[PDB]
Amino acid sequence: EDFDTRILEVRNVFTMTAKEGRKKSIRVLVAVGNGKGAAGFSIGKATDRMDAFRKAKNRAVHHLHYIERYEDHTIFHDISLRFKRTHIKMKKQPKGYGLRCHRAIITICRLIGIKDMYAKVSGSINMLSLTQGLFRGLSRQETHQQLADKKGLHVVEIREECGPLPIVVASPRGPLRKDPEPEDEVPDVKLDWEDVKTAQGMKRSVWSNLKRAAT
Amino acid sequence: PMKGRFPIRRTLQYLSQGNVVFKDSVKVMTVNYNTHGELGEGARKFVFFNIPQIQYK
Amino acid sequence: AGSRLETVGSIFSRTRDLVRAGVLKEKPLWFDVYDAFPPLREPVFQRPRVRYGKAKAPIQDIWYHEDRIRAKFYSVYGSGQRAFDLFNPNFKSTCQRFVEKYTELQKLGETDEEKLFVETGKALLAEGVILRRVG
Amino acid sequence: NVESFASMLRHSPLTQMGPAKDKLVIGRIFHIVENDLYIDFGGKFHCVCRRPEVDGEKYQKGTRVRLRLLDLELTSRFLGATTDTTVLEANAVLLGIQE
Amino acid sequence: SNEDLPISMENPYKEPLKKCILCGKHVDYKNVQLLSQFVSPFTGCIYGRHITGLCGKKQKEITKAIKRAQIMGFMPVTYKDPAYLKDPKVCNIRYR
Amino acid sequence: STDFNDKILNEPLKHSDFFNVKELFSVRSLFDARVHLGHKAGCRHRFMEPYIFGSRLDHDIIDLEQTATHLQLALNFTAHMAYRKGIILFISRNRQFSYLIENMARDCGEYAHTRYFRGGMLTNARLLFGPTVRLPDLIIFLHTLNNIFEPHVAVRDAAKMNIPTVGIVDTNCNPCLITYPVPGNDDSPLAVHLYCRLFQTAITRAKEKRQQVEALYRLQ
Amino acid sequence: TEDFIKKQIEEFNIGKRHLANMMGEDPETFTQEDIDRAIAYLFPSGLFEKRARPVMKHRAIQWGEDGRPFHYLFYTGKQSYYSLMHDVYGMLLNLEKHQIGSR
Numbered sequence A: 001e002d003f004d005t006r007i008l009e010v011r012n013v014f015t016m017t018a019k020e021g022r023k024k025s026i027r028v029l030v031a032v033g034n035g036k037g038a039a040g041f042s043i044g045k046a047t048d049r050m051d052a053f054r055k056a057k058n059r060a061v062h063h064l065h066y067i068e069r070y071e072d073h074t075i076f077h078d079i080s081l082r083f084k085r086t087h088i089k090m091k092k093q094p095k096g097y098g099l100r101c102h103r104a105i106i107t108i109c110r111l112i113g114i115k116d117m118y119a120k121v122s123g124s125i126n127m128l129s130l131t132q133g134l135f136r137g138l139s140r141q142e143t144h145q146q147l148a149d150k151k152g153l154h155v156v157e158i159r160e161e162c163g164p165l166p167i168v169v170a171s172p173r174g175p176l177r178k179d180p181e182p183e184d185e186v187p188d189v190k191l192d193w194e195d196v197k198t199a200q201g202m203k204r205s206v207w208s209n210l211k212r213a214a215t
Numbered sequence B: 001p002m003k004g005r006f007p008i009r010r011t012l013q014y015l016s017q018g019n020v021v022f023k024d025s026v027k028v029m030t031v032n033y034n035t036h037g038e039l040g041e042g043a044r045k046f047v048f049f050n051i052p053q054i055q056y057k
Numbered sequence C: 001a002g003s004r005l006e007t008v009g010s011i012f013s014r015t016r017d018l019v020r021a022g023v024l025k026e027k028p029l030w031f032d033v034y035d036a037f038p039p040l041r042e043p044v045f046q047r048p049r050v051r052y053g054k055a056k057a058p059i060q061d062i063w064y065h066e067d068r069i070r071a072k073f074y075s076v077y078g079s080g081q082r083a084f085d086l087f088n089p090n091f092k093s094t095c096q097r098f099v100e101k102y103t104e105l106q107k108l109g110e111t112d113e114e115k116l117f118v119e120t121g122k123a124l125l126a127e128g129v130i131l132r133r134v135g
Numbered sequence D: 001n002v003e004s005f006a007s008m009l010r011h012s013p014l015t016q017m018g019p020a021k022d023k024l025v026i027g028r029i030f031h032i033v034e035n036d037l038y039i040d041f042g043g044k045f046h047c048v049c050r051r052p053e054v055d056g057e058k059y060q061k062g063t064r065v066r067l068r069l070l071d072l073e074l075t076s077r078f079l080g081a082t083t084d085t086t087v088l089e090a091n092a093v094l095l096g097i098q099e
Numbered sequence E: 001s002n003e004d005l006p007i008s009m010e011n012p013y014k015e016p017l018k019k020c021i022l023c024g025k026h027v028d029y030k031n032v033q034l035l036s037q038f039v040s041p042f043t044g045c046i047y048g049r050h051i052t053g054l055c056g057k058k059q060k061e062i063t064k065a066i067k068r069a070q071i072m073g074f075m076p077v078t079y080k081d082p083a084y085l086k087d088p089k090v091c092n093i094r095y096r
Numbered sequence F: 001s002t003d004f005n006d007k008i009l010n011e012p013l014k015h016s017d018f019f020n021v022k023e024l025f026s027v028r029s030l031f032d033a034r035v036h037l038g039h040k041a042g043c044r045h046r047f048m049e050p051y052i053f054g055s056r057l058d059h060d061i062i063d064l065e066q067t068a069t070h071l072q073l074a075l076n077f078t079a080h081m082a083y084r085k086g087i088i089l090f091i092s093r094n095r096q097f098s099y100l101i102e103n104m105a106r107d108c109g110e111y112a113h114t115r116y117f118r119g120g121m122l123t124n125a126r127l128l129f130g131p132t133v134r135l136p137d138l139i140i141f142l143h144t145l146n147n148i149f150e151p152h153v154a155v156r157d158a159a160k161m162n163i164p165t166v167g168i169v170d171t172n173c174n175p176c177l178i179t180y181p182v183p184g185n186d187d188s189p190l191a192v193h194l195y196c197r198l199f200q201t202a203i204t205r206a207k208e209k210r211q212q213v214e215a216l217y218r219l220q
Numbered sequence G: 001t002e003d004f005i006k007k008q009i010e011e012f013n014i015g016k017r018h019l020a021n022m023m024g025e026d027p028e029t030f031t032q033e034d035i036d037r038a039i040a041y042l043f044p045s046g047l048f049e050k051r052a053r054p055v056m057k058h059r060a061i062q063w064g065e066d067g068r069p070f071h072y073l074f075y076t077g078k079q080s081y082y083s084l085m086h087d088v089y090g091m092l093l094n095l096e097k098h099q100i101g102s103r
């Protein structure tokens, strides 16, 4: 009863059979979630639409990923993934930013319990691939505690609204590492051209940052 | 993604980080460096990293 | 019930995540035991990939100093009449006795391989070993 | 005082024996179906040898026999196979009863 | 550490490679007998390496020597020299 | 019931080796039982590389030093599960040992499945047996490979159903999805007999210790 | 479960006592054949299929209240057949170690 069920795609699929000519069936992609991290998705094939809904939504709850949410409202870090031919770029956002994401991603994030995140989908926008890649990336994300345990250093949050106050959001479980870590002069990180263009203001898309209803 | 190794170099935010602004006397700067040899390694990295910023400033 | 995504994390990770999320009403009987005595490696699914480049399996071959002596003995004499009783853990073959004699004679001070081999053969023949040379 | 595993492996009779090719070993017939003697010789796998026509009735379960090993495990990769295929049995030639 | 740890070395039990019968021996176009040992008695055809059991290098050497002898009047082309029929049969061929 | 549930259930988890399973075996015993013997180097599976001591004349040898620790962990886990009155299901499609394994199960008050594993014995148990059926709380593989040398479908099914699995993995096995893998020979009769005896002894010791603890608590 | 079967057994015993009272028979020696004859007389049905006629007469579950199955081969799904095969194979092993009008 704590889980909510949402439809993501309803496709009519036909097959060529000698006995019946063109056989018709319904394939339904269903996402379920309890709004507290536990969410899943499933595919239901049936001759009847309601039967497909029932099959998919009853099968989804047996395939529940648990998505870790930072402060119970957002992802822990930016996630860049390419599932098949679908690129998903998720940006961690502060409280109150809302869900500026693909409508399917908006629905899935509502099911998970994410309230603030950005998400851009590029390449193929196939709904099944989009959902699978989104769940893969969200499940594979690394929490602050895991990072602190892995590198044995305090994970400290710096907030502009809080000034120079250092907020220790994570601390290693085991002994702390006294290595002051490498002060990398230049980070060898693969940037995304769209993000740099937006930061430098060269991007002038008439569709970005459009006023939209609350999400 | 942005092409090339260390694509951060090709950003305004990185170019503006250069803290070296030459005096008005300086007009030409010649950077003689060796593509190989550990002793010149830093110089190479300098050419790879700080020549843009300097030229931006 | 529990998540059936066997390729996402381990059974312990999935069960703990679901219990924390409140989906699983009660922890399974094995959860406390796993928490108390976890295995050396978390049973996370992993797809095996075949090596393609210069990378090779780090499984080193097993060799000993007595292997050269055994090879020489088998080349000169062969298997021999004394069959191998592999069931007996303390069984010593003719080759093993030859190796022991070679090792003790080398410890005595002799260093030449041919001299060690011939002295070992003569000593075993004196001891009552049928060292039938094949060539 | 317990010796390390390396010592046991080094001094084991199986390691003392070199390649199994044409080595003489003593095996025990642990199974008989009709005429196929399943004999263990201390290796990982057993060997199956047809019952010889000479003194065939004298080959019974528990009989100790002499074998000349040819391969401790018959394996052979095939065209397009990623890993070596095995038949889960060794290859030995049965000579006769050991006494 | 411990002496019982296996040592890194090459295989001492490794058997030598099965050297071909003509390995290490000079093959000459004037040796009509040796060349005739590898040709068909009836047709004079040069046997393949799957029949002669020779390596690639020695098979090529034998082929070149046979061609040279045939073109230079040392060896019959369409058959085998009858005086060399009594030589040992190194080829893996069975006509009967 | 908390004074009972705590004292009987949680207390053995406070001990590194409550059932003293480390006395049941030694590296010498495993060596005698030909546990260390493995398949040919060609048949080697990648994930079994860390547990392989080395290759002796193209024959893989299983590191009994790691095998000792893995077997200690597996026996401790099995004993703790049996002590908690869990359901233990041995699985092995190796026909040669099938009978024996079944006997061992029948002698240790646990369950065995050595015959053909029908599709869905675990993922569809609610329909095959009944909606109120109780799935096994632990599955022990004496052989992790089917007769076509592929991994047993029971491994994947138990991973799906979140059932911990102890397993004897040879050099060609796939220990990725096994909760407590024990690298050891699974073909030699001596090795399989040793494994059966060890698991039987662990389960019997756990059950008798559970009876002793319950009786002692009742007499308190 | 077994509780339902036991309740049915008690109900059958009570009904058997009532039937013996109605027929005037001795409730002690009122056997199954007497029950069938009394039922056939009291409820005469001429349906040819004898299974459809009225009848007053006396599968199970393979695990207890704790969920532990009784048979060690339960998870095979064919515990009876495989137990029989196991016993036959054991007898064959014993025979090997030691050494018409029927169909």
Ligand code: FES
Residues within 6 Å of the ligand: E018, E019, E020, E021, E022, E023, E024, E054, E055, E056, E057, E058
């Ligand atoms: S075998 Fe040596 S040249 Fe062919």
Ligand SMILES: [Mg+2]
Residues within 6 Å of the ligand: F039, F170, F171, F185, F186, F187
């Ligand atoms: Mg095996």
